[PDB]
From a paper:
To elucidate the structural basis for the recognition of internal di-substitutions, the crystal structure of XacAbf51 was determined unveiling the existence of a pocket strategically arranged near to the − 1 subsite that can accommodate a second arabinofuranosyl decoration, a feature not described for any other [name] Abf structurally characterized so far. The catalytic residues Glu182 (acid–base) and Glu304 (nucleophile) are positioned 3.7 Å apart from each other within the active site pocket. A glycerol molecule occupied the − 1 subsite in a conformation that mimics part of the Araf ring. All residues from this subsite are identical or semi-conserved between XacAbf51 and [name] structures known so far, except for Cys80 and Cys186. These cysteine residues form a disulfide bridge in XacAbf51 and TxAbfD3, which likely contributes to the high thermostability of these enzymes. In the crystal structure of XacAbf51, six protein chains compose the asymmetric unit, but in a different spatial disposition from that observed for known [name] hexamers such as TxAbfD3. Analysis of the crystal interfaces using jsPISA indicates that trimers, composed by ABC or DEF chains, are the most stable quaternary structure of XacAbf51. The small angle X-ray scattering (SAXS) curve of XacAbf51 revealed a radius of gyration (4.5 nm) and a low-resolution molecular envelope that are consistent with the crystallographic trimer.
More generalist Abfs that release Araf from both mono- and di-substituted Xylp residues have been found in [name] and GH54 families. As a typical [name] enzyme, XacAbf51 harbors the active site in a (β/α)8-barrel that is tightly associated with a β-sandwich domain.
Residue numbers in the entry:
A (entry chain C), C (entry chain B): 8 to 500
B (entry chain A): 4 to 500
């Protein structure tokens, strides 16, 4: 009864779908670092040099491409020197944005950078422009990357790291329109131009610089930043949260009806319009697309769970959140020439997390499983997938009934992702494949019995992928019986 | 010499109570300047000048007696170059700095954060802290606020504790830059608004107290400054500062504080009255962006500025304080109280030994100025209720200058009594003032008068009460009328039963 | 065949030709400081307290009027505190612009300032605006100049200097349009206004403040800086390099034909148009001419010599460079009412140097000899000299065949400088002198047998001044037989 037709053009390959679209984001916020990543060398939670083993293994298994640290709003007040040297001598600071709680600085530059090397991931460092003078980020970059025998390099060596680390991405201010200094873009562009000057790449590696970009539909911000500074940036950040009910976040993460379901998906899909319009502005100043659009905060933002400190942003992660992730990956992959990095907010225990921990307990969220399903998209080639779908309507809201994307992976196999956004109606999908003879199709499905299903320590697999039985090939057509509220990932052979 | 007596008629509407006249209109201002801090307030624990923890006792008692509501510190121009860490920790380890604006003399930093904040607690007054925006990065004021107010066991809070203060202090007002159009960085307002927006971001209130933020506002009639600061930043400020000095003869200040004729008298009063026009016009601009009046207009520098006294360091701004200065203060209090919905803070420049001071000291000697006595007379205005007082007054004219012959204001005080202030601006003519009182049955009136035999009279160590308030016998009640025989060059404060 | 007629008006004296037009510029760059000036107390190169003796003597002999230090691009990242205190405790920094090499900071504030006193020259200090807060330059000025017992003054005393030094000129940012923070002028004007506020003169001496001005023909920069900030500056800097072939610098400093000769002189003469047009803008906002135009970078910029580190800007210095210097001195002296300071880039071993060193070897360049010839111009009086000259043409380029200038010196004598720009043709110059009875004339000539002649350690006097015998007086006329490619300086009795 819901019928979806489409075309896959394997013969019209497009741009690389960057692995950096699967970036993570670990702010010093709530238990995102302390408990979520760092437990300390003396913890009875099994750990490697203080990093909990369960989280390390889980993040390695989805091949995290980069982690942005330490913020976020925290980064615009962070002083990197507070986080180096003997732990006993590091100052206790106040985390002003996120509960006004004490920050021990036990997890600092060496602990984060060595964590990235343990995962085999890239570091995306967020520098302080709002409350520091430019010399702070200049010295931080030298400390981390200098191969010479300068005082800062020698101080890194004294602190136990002989060789430079790689710092491939460096954010030059975070949310400058808000928590980073309430700046008009005219002022922020001047500040960016100045502060970026003093972050210099040594001969031995290139540090790419990400300029502070718009929130939501702030097109004026993009216009000015690009007009004034496009020659001085390697990327421009944009931020868009999916916030059912609007700001401030009051929607339940655990308990919701179909109206809240469709509203959430409707809001998340706005990402496509935002990327389109911000990209078009970037094209006016940067037609060769040298500057990446960097979506370095996205995801859902709900009411805090009952009983939790609201400054710690703890929320559950349901099937709804899985669909949010699949729809955003689809959208990013459709804009792959310009959108070359993204970072979901946030990695562990905060906002739309991969993982929830509580002492030695750990659970993988439905969102984690979507990152796992879409692993073949990492550094794949975009393929055009054009779907002819009816709308799913509930009350005064409508969204596409089915959404999807496709790639040719580095192993040479074609993958098709499909999502059925309808809370109760299945769909029959028929995709005509051009440019590749088919014999077979294998797949996995992520769904659950109810839209509001989430994983817990006691029921860790309520939402988890299983083998999918509803895909078949006939002639040049892939036919899919796609259940309500589900995501499938199909591999053609 | 002689001038004929004048008639003034007026109406007092006790039945039309208006806005609260904030006690913060009586704010003081103690910059690190000349002997305003060193000698004027701080003598050190080992001084032979009688002192409590290094604060001279005589000044403490005098300031307590006028119920100082807040003190702004440490500037002024000094604040835009001050580094708060220079003023904390063991005194011998604090650096000696240079007071660049005010004589280029050494600043010992012996009077720093702890000494000022503990002084405010000794007086029972509020701290109005002036933060450095001009020559510091924003992290300095951010850390300063944490040091002073954090209740947690952060390193900065523990440093405050190490330096002898366990509990946080209260920091109810925080200035985010001082005179940014001038000594704070010669900024165009368009740039200052961006800088203010940025620096204010990082001054955060802990959960335990609210720190109000005062934005750097206009000098004199710089309406463009108010327009841009309000247009660009009104949502980020609790107050906007304005500055207006009374400078007879204009800048640079060359008029004598001790010796003057009637032309200089009326010129000074004419110039001081311009405050009303400035407040009116700056308020109207603020109304366009902030019609609910959430942002206070903060007059945080006002008062007279004269030539320095002969033989003094001109960078120390030492001037005498005469009957003329008393009238300047009474006229300004009248004006502020007429604008009480918007003007909710003011700070006279400056508290001890500097500009229009409350107190002058010289070693163990201390004298209370005529201006001090006006703060004392107007104490009942603190947190009082404004009452409309309309006066129909002739002009006082001398040469090509004219001012109202009589000026005044009224309140209903928290003690429940109605008070009426009247000032006769005429250097030689007495006035008969007849006030029709509505909404209050009249039984009795008493009062005090501040005057002197000559306009150019001031207080000295040798003649400490040449200008000082005494019982006033020239008010009478009849029916619904208060009749006042108001001498030339005088201020009266009347209390109705 | 080439005949030039002129008129000298000794009876119409003009403005003072400031000695500061002969300023030098010593950036921390290559071997300009380390090797070129500072060898260290432990060096076998003969030295006085670490300053090499040969360079000290040579610079004293041309009466250097001021030296600008320490940059240049280096100055916008320099932290003065790194260069004071016990040498063992000073941090090693990175010279990011000029090879990414280590900077020991052994040559710091005391070493530079005591060097200026040894030479009897003035210090022109270049302050950090780009990457520092304003408190740094404020404290630096106090450290150097405070006569009080402030902590900064006491620290100078502890470091071995009891009395203040004189700091007569202070640059408030360097190249803010580029290496100093990539600032548009509207932002730079706001930054200058703010930072200059906090550089204060003590009662005991006046510190003049130089505002960051235009590169080349950036008239918009001059317009905005003067419109917004002329009341806060004692001088406005301008920069103009003579770069044959254009940016990036690829022309040989050693080997060139007549086309490259005339192209270089044509490019250097553009200085006159730039000064004219920048001066006219300054006149609109500063009609009294209170603000000096300060040419604090000029000179030739060539390809780096073979085998050298390209970040050290090492080039040779030929007869062509001598004529560049004489033409620039002529031009500056014609604009002496407004142009009151200039600094050639750079003093030793860098760009159009006075001196080249290599270990204990030292050579004086052709450019040095032009500074020597023009010594009588120091604090002289400008005299109007009108020359009617044919053009020198080679291919599609033309320049005046002869160029010159004249002064009445403080020694009471009139001096006339003439340059023959032609690579091969001599000129006959006839100057009618008004307002001075003529008795005799003598002079010196700087030339060489070939245009591409330069000085080396093996041939240190290939280009050096000798007595000139080709001037004679007849009636009221000075007649000069002026050789091809030559500079003469004539002294009238």
């Amino acid at each position: 009864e819901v019928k979806v037709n489409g075309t896959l053009r394997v013969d019209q390959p497009g741009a690389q779908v960057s692995r950096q679209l699967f970036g993570q984001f670990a702010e010093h916020l709530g238990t995102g670092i302390y408990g979520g990543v760092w437990v300390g060398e003396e913890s009875p939670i099994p750990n490697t040099h203080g990093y909990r083993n369960d989280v390390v293994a889980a993040l390695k298994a989805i091949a995290v491409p980069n982690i942005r640290w330490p913020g976020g709003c925290f980064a615009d007040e962070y002083h990197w020197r507070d986080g180096v040297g003997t732990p006993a001598k590091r100052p206790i600071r106040v985390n002003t944005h996120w509960g006004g709680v004490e920050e021990s600085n036990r997890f600092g530059t060496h602990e984060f950078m060595d964590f990235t090397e343990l995962l085999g991931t890239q570091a995306y460092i967020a520098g302080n422009v709002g409350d520091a003078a430019p010399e702070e980020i200049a010295q931080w970059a030298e400390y981390m990357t200098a191969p010479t025998r300068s005082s800062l390099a020698n101080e890194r060596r004294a602190n136990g790291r002989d060789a430079p680390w790689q710092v491939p991405y460096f954010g030059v201010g975070n949310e400058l329109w808000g928590c980073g200094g309430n700046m008009r873009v005219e002022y922020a562009a001047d500040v960016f131009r100045r502060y970026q000057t003093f972050v210099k790449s040594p001969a031995s590696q290139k540090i790419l610089k990400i300029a502070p970009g718009p929130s939501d539909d702030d097109y004026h911000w993009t216009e000015v930043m690009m007009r004034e500074a496009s020659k001085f940036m390697d990327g421009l950040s944009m931020h868009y949260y999916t916030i059912p009910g609007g700001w401030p976040p009051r929607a339940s993460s655990t308990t919701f009806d179909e109206a809240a379901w469709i509203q959430t998906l409707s809001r998340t899909l706005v990402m496509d319009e935002l990327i389109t319009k911000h990209s078009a502005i970037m094209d006016k100043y940067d037609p060769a697309k040298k500057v990446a659009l960097v979506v370095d905060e996205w995801g859902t933002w709900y009411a805090p769970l009952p009983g939790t400190n609201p400054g710690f942003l703890q929320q559950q992660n349901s099937l709804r959140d899985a669909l949010v992730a699949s729809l955003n990956f689809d959208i990013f992959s459709q804009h792959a020439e310009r959108v070359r990095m993204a970072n979901i907010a946030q990695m562990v225990n905060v906002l739309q997390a991969m993982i929830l921990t509580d002492g030695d307990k750990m659970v993988l969220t439905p969102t984690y499983h979507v990152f796992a399903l879409y692993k073949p998209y990492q550094d794949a080639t975009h393929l055009p997938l054009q779907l002819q779908t009816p709308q799913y309507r509930h009350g005064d809201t409508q969204v596409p009934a089915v959404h999807g994307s496709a790639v040719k992976a580095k192993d040479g196999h074609v993958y098709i992702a499909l999502t059925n956004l309808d809370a109760s109606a299945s769909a029959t999908v028929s995709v005509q494949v051009e440019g590749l003879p088919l014999r077979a199709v294998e797949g996995q499905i992520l769904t659950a019995p109810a839209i509001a299903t989430y994983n817990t320590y006691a029921q860790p697999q309520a939402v988890a992928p299983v083998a999918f039985k509803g895909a078949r090939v006939q002639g040049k057509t892939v036919n899919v019986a796609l259940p309500a509220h589900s995501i499938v990932m199909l591999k053609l052979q």
